[PDB]
Design a protein around this ligand. Structure first.
Ligand code: DTP
Ligand code: SF4
Ligand code: MG
Length: 1114
DNA sequence: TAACCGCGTTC
DNA sequence: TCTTGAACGCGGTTA
């Protein structure tokens, strides 16, 4: 069957890898001991593992499944070895009495696929008394191949759906072996992952291939060096349109190999014989490119395909090559009669992405999207290169590439080549070390470590831990389709997340005095807690003792001066310090403090201080209908013929689509009757957390957090090295910076995976699901951060607060940073505002019930006090600009701008210029104003220097843009906007992006709006009027097209049949665009100035009504 | 006015 | 088949 067509395919693959140099090496036979202390005398071959692929092999009739491992040896060659391992899953029963009887049933019903049967015990944390050593008995169903495992799984799931569904009734006045199968387990594990876990094999490690298995060579830890190749293509699309594979040609293909770069050209579209040249933006990224000037598109592709075979790459890297680059090559190779699989070994898979067997295809766009921590507006290759590579790649309009093929091709080749050097060094500096080091710990291959969701990565890490501790894997979670509460059907239940608040707004600077009204009782507490808060810092936060200090009383008196000095002067006016307090890896440390894991959340029925009762906050959004109502609409629905995708009944439907209809018909009934559709209620629930459960989950979080803490630490050490270096030595400074951009990206690359251990608990299909633990983690974080704000509020003023961070000001007379001294010829760091917080969270949040198993054989536990929740401080900063809302008594959260002592921009957040695709004028306005919030010498002087830039930008919108040129206009007025889906999935929804897409469709043709993610760049129109903005967006692209279609389309949407004008200035509603500018100046300039006591610096933007009335009263 | 949506941020 | 979470700003429609 498919074993036959699956064993044919391997032949093909087996021959491809041999063509690309991957011999199938079988180790010599060895009748000796499986020694580990010396692997040198055991005969075999050493290799650095570089890929894995599940395959189907034959002896030495149906296939026996296994994994092909691709190696790079130390002699400079390569080989390939295979392991065989029986796929398997388990069966669980109700009655341990009858365990041997159902095994008899399994052997006979699964006769055609079962290979072996076994009775296995595993620890199951679902089970009473499992912490005393009790285990659960399972039946292990091994198989030959994975095609037979699937057959058996399709033979039992019928039984599983009888043992629950019904129960036939016969003799009403009155046990089968089939009803003992409670469930199957570990049935949905992918085969290649099952092998790497059970055999403890990872890509990026060194193994000595031997007859009895792979032996990890603990000696060599450093990676080997593959042969890397990155490439980017250039095409010849039509003007105004994205390239199509059918017609469009292929001008060039640039690529790089192991540090030497190459370029091949198509002379039927080009026009010159480009000569060998150099392009290195920085001396660290060489780019000497030798060009292969070829004639036709076939000579192109045939030289590319032959060069790959001549270099044997183990990794091909691209940039959005799975959605464009590769897929075009295949369609233009088929168009010219070639087989990519037969020539290179690449082909698309079930997900549409391109892969091979010997060569991992690394699409850099997936590391940038997932691990770069860059905003979506910075995920193009240019923004990525400036951010991560430290130079500017050459930009070129897409609508000038194919003309400049004939026009000026020696610059076109520089674009071609710049995209390659960007892609090659981006991969070599960021993608290669991150992904391959991630394969060291995560049991997948490079092209899957690169593409899986971060939640799935966490699932993989937790499975290795569950397997090595002999823990039975829970099945994948399935959400209940119907859930109720007090008689109402619910729309969405959730917990309340973190705590966000904006408190003050405006400008604050390290040289402009501020007013601090201080609570004396607050300092009185700081007075009492002071002796123990310093004993805190030296012990908990530095791992030392006050016995070794030389100056504890010397500094304790030193800082009690500055606090008692303030005890008298409650009201002061001094320069402020701008500081930031944020706890390091909050939610992970909240979890590892409270021993929080999903299996630790028990009930009353799952059970002297082991149970730790913690509180979370449930939030439900339910309909305002009762079940009498709910019952009434189901009867109406039952008398309706529904389509089949000829017409079926309501009960013949799928239950999932039943609720869908019910919800859509309860959608409108509940509204017209019960006045609304969503009613919100939040109840604070309590849950217990066993402090003695198998800590396999929380130990995976602690292990991964510790793995990130080192990178986050090394970055700080190199930050100080950059401080203590002369402001000139080029190499030095550069080197530092280079290292601090790598170690910040790396620690941030671990940041999302680390925090995905908390999100995994709520993920759809999670094996370890529990709404309780995610809610407990958030409310603990909320209560911690609100306790911290209540303290700083009484001694300074916090400006903004989010989840675990607090921006604040404190008077300059407040104690800042001191350093303890030891008799070791060393010193210890202390910043009092951090420690005063950390002492008091270590007094109201430590876990005095943390129990750990300290002798397993006798099942003894021991209690201690664990808490790893520390604040960290960054600063002091020079300035911070916080906007304010256009409504009364309301700031705005999640956006501000801070500035380093240097004047450099430290952090800018939330605003429109960072966001992907807003309107460029607002983006250009914002990238102009925050900089001149640093000029001037008084506050009201600041707001007027910034007002100059505000009025100059208003002059552009007030003068109808007649100062900007007819080409520098269209970009400053553009509004580029992405559409997550395709048009027909938006029917019923009317936005500006919607109509721009439909208008761009019947102009350029339906080929423009085929795939999703399309960029709706448009302008708002003046005509028609007395109408919505929704029905007024004009696709900006028409203005470069042909005049009659210009007038035809524009006249249709303007409702004016006369072609009065064709200029952008004619149709654009300037009153709209100046109102969107007026809102920006209100939020960032004037309203902030008012609340700081400065009259309107830009009186051309008018204060809102409520603030005028508030000004008149004062 | 206020609820509610899509998008893309900040956590 | 594959799949981290919630809170929020802002423009825009809808009730
Ligand atoms: N992608 C995310 N997914 C889930 N939770 C997140 C995410 N980002 C931030 N958070 C949640 C969990 C965080 O611990 C918590 C605080 O975020 P944040 O302070 O920015 O980083 P962090 O506290 O986890 O590490 P650190 O502060 O050292 O950079 O909010
Ligand atoms: S809290 Fe105590 S009684 Fe309850 S399950 Fe855990 S160990 Fe058993
Ligand atoms: Mg934090």
């Amino acid at each position: 069957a498919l074993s036959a067509q699956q064993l044919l395919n391997a032949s093909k693959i087996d021959d491809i890898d041999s063509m690309m140099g991957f011999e199938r090496y079988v180790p010599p036979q060895y009748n000796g001991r499986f020694d580990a202390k010396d692997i040198d005398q055991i005969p075999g071959r050493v290799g650095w593992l570089t890929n894995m692929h599940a395959t189907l092999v034959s002896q030495e009739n149906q296939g026996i499944s296994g994994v092909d491992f691709y190696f790079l040896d130390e002699e400079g060659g390569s080989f390939k070895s295979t392991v065989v391992y029986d796929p398997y899953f388990f069966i669980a029963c109700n009655d341990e009495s009858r365990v041997n009887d159902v095994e008899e049933l399994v052997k006979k019903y699964l006769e055609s696929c079962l290979k072996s049967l076994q009775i296995i015990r595993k620890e199951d944390l679902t089970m009473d008394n499992h912490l005393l050593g009790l285990q659960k008995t399972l039946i292990k169903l091994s198989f030959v191949n994975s095609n037979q495992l699937f057959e058996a799984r399709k033979l039992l799931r019928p039984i599983l759906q009888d043992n629950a569904n019904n129960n036939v009734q016969r003799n009403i006045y009155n046990v089968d072996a089939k009803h003992l199968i409670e469930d199957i387990r570990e049935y949905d594990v992918p085969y290649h992952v099952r092998v790497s876990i059970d055999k403890d094999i990872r890509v990026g490690k060194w193994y000595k291939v031997t007859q009895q298995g792979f032996i990890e060579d603990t000696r060599k830890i450093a990676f080997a060096d593959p042969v890397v190749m990155a490439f980017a293509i250039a095409t010849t699309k039509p003007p105004l349109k994205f390239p199509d594979s059918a017609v469009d040609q292929i001008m060039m293909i640039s690529y790089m190999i192991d540090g030497e770069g190459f370029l091949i050209t198509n002379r039927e579209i080009i026009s010159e014989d480009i000569e060998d040249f150099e392009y290195t933006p920085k001396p660290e990224y060489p780019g000497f490119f030798t060009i292969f000037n070829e004639n036709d598109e076939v000579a192109l592709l045939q030289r590319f395909f032959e060069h790959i075979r001549d270099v044997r790459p183990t990794v091909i890297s691209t940039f959005n090559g799975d959605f464009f680059d590769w897929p075009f090559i295949h369609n233009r190779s088929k168009i010219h009669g070639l087989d990519m699989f037969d020539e290179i070994g690449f082909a698309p898979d079930a997900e549409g992405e391109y892969k091979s067997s010997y060569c991992s295809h690394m699409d850099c766009f997936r590391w940038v999207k997932r691990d770069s921590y860059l905003p979506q507006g910075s995920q193009g290759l240019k923004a990525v290169t400036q951010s991560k590579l430290g130079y500017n790649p050459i930009e070129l309009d897409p609508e000038l590439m194919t003309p400049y093929a004939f026009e000026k091709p020696q610059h076109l080749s520089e674009y071609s080549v710049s995209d390659a050097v960007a892609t090659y060094y981006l991969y070599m500096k960021y993608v290669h070390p991150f992904i391959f080091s991630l394969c060291t710990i995560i049991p997948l291959n490079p092209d899957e470590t690169l593409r899986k969701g971060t939640g799935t990565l966490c699932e993989m890490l937790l499975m290795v831990q569950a397997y090595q501790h002999n823990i039975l894997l829970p099945n994948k979670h399935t959400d209940p389709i119907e859930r109720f509460y007090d008689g109402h059907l619910l729309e969405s239940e959730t917990y309340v997340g973190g705590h966000v608040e904006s408190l003050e707004a405006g400008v604050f600077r390290s040289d402009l005095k501020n007013e601090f009204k201080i609570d004396p009782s607050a300092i009185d507490e700081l007075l009492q807690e002071l002796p123990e808060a310093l004993k805190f810092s030296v012990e908990v936060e530095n791992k030392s003792s006050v016995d070794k200090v030389t100056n504890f009383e010397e500094i304790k008196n030193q800082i009690t001066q500055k606090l008692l000095e303030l005890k008298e002067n409650n009201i002061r006016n001094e320069l402020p310090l701008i500081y930031h307090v944020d706890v390091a890896s909050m939610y992970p440390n909240i979890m590892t403090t409270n021993r929080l894991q999903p299996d630790s959340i028990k009930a009353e029925r799952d059970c002297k201080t082991c149970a730790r009762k913690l509180k979370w906050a449930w939030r439900g959004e339910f309909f305002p209908s009762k079940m009498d109502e709910y019952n009434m609409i189901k009867r109406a629905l039952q008398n309706e013929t529904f389509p089949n995708k000829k017409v079926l009944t309501f009960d013949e439907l799928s239950y999932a689509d039943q609720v869908i209809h019910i919800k859509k018909r309860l959608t409108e009934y509940s509204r017209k009757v019960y006045h609304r559709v969503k009613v919100s209620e939040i109840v604070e629930r309590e849950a217990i957390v066993c402090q003695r459960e198998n800590p396999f989950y929380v130990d995976t979080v602690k292990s991964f957090r510790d793995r990130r803490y080192e990178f986050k630490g090394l970055a700080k050490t190199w930050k100080g090295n950059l401080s203590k270096i002369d402001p000139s030595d080029k190499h030095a400074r550069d080197e530092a910076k280079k290292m601090i951009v790598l170690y910040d990206s790396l620690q941030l690359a671990h940041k999302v995976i680390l925090n995905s251990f908390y999100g995994y608990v709520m993920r759809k299909g999670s094996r370890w699901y529990s709404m309780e633990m995610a809610g407990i983690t958030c409310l603990t974080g909320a209560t911690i951060i609100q306790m911290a704000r209540a303290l700083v509020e009484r001694v300074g003023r916090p400006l903004e607060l989010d989840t675990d961070g607090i921006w604040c000001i404190l008077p300059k007379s407040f104690p800042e940073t001191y350093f303890f001294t030891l008799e070791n010829g060393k010193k210890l760091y202390l910043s009092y505002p951090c420690s005063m917080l950390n002492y008091r969270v270590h007094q109201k949040f430590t876990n005095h019930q943390y129990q750990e198993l300290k002798d397993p054989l006798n099942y003894i536990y021991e209690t201690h006090s664990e808490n790893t929740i520390f604040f960290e401080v960054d600063g002091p900063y020079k300035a911070m600009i916080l906007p304010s809302s256009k409504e009364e008594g309301k700031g705005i959260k999640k956006r501000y701008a801070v500035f380093n002592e240097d004047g450099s921009l430290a952090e800018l957040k939330g605003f429109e210029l960072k966001r992907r695709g807003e309107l460029q004028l607002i983006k250009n306005f914002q990238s102009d104003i925050f900089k001149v919030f640093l000029e001037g010498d008084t506050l009201e002087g600041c707001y007027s220097a910034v007002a100059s830039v505000c009025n100059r930008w208003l002059d552009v919108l007030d003068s109808h843009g007649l100062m900007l040129e007819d080409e520098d206009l269209v970009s400053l007025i553009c509004e580029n906007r992405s559409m997550s889906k395709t048009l027909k999935e938006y029917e019923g929804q009317k936005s500006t992006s919607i109509t721009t897409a439909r208008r761009l469709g019947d102009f350029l043709g339906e080929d423009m709006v085929k795939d999703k993610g399309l960029q709706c760049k448009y302008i708002i129109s003046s005509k028609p009027f007395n109408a919505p903005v929704t029905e007024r967006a004009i696709p900006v692209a028409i203005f470069s097209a042909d005049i009659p279609i210009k007038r035809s389309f524009l006249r249709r949407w303007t409702l004016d049949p006369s072609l009065e004008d064709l200029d952008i200035r004619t149709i654009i509603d300037w009153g709209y665009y100046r109102e969107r500018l007026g809102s920006a100046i209100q939020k960032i300039i004037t309203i902030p100035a008012a609340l700081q006591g400065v009259s309107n610096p830009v009186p051309r933007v008018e204060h809102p009504d409520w603030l005028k009335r508030k000004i008149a009263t004062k």
